[PDB]
């Protein structure tokens, strides 16, 4: 009756930024989503295709937990079907999703008085993202007929802007830590039961 590591994915000491998020696989486990559900410290616990209280007696074979940090107002764009900056350039969920999106406030944890400038997000990309696809590419971006090759001049810009995370920012611009719990079912035996 040896419970699964969720104390590695939620109360971690430092999450990653959104443009290179952290994908972690769950294998050989037994979880209990009611402890996640009846903690009442999370702000947005929305499940998108499975009912949350019946999650314990539902036995899957691999769970994927993705962790990243976004602005507080952009937690709406971690839903199936929404578009926006983060949604089409940073982290796109497919529109047949079945999982649980968790979010809670983390200002004290991720905000220095001068402001942390190590949480970044993708601003310029050629096209949108197909779902569940990261793109850690620090190459400069370009627009009309002439390419840059790293000069960073006019018509060429770095693909990242920095989040401004100050302790006096607003309840909607405080940095929110999200975790996208995502379920799957491969042709394999049951590995996580609950």
């Amino acid at each position: 009756t040896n419970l699964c590591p969720f104390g590695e994915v939620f109360n971690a000491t430092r999450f990653a930024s959104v443009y290179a998020w952290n994908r972690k696989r769950i294998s050989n486990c037994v979880a209990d989503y009611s402890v996640l559900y009846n903690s009442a410290s999370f702000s947005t616990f929305k499940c998108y295709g499975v009912s949350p209280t019946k999650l314990n007696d539902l036995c899957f074979t691999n769970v994927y937990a993705d962790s990243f940090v976004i602005r507080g107002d952009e937690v709406r764009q971690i839903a199936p079907g929404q578009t926006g900056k983060i949604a089409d350039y940073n982290y796109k969920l497919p529109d047949d999703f079945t999982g649980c999106v968790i979010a809670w406030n983390s200002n004290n944890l991720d905000s220095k008085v001068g402001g942390n400038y190590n949480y970044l997000y993708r601003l310029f990309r050629k096209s949108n993202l197909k779902p569940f696809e990261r793109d850690i590419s620090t190459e400069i971006y370009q627009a009309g007929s002439t390419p840059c090759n790293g000069v960073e001049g006019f018509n060429c810009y770095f693909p990242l802007q920095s989040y401004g995370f100050q302790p006096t920012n607003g309840v909607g611009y405080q940095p929110y830590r999200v975790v996208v719990l995502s379920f799957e079912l491969l042709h394999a035996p049951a590995t996580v039961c609950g």
Partner: antibody
Amino acid sequence: EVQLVESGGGLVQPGGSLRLSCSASGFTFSSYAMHWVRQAPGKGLEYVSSISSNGGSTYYADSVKGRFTISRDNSKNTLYLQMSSLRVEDAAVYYCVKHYQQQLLWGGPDVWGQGTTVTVSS
Amino acid sequence: DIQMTQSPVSLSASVGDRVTITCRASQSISTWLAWYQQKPGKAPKLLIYETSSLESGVPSRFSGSGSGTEFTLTISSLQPDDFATYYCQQFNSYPWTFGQGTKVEIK
């Protein structure tokens, strides 16, 4: 009160030279990149030249470049537009714009100047 | 070099009419567009910026809309201090290509 004003201008024979000036006051001059945009009289607008925040990078249109050069001076609150190998297609007014943003160059003009008439004849 | 078609090139409209001027690009820019108003005899003035954001000090009857390839400006009730030309301008790609012109003479 943000304001821009230019001087210079006049006439020049084809093949001559002219230096323009864009003296700005009322804002932080070194943190706001500025551009020139020209307009032939009785015609539409057109884009000609630009410069970065500290004179680092320039980018002109391909139809004018090579014969032009731009320069600015952060200690004098002025912007210069040095012209050489002049032709008949440059007989236009030359406005002076400035950015909406700071030190990022990826779009948006904010306020426009007053222009000074440059024409060519013989 | 995204050349933009601004249509109609010339029209007339009386006081209190809802006029619409549309500006359409070839390459799809992404909500980077600004309008202008050029009184005949002096410099243009920045009215609409970033395709929706009304600039400060401007009368609020001006309102830009549209997204994608084509973009539209509209005025609710036309006032007798608005008989100017309205240019459109992209700034997605850095070679800036302005519009064509719309000589709105009030009849």
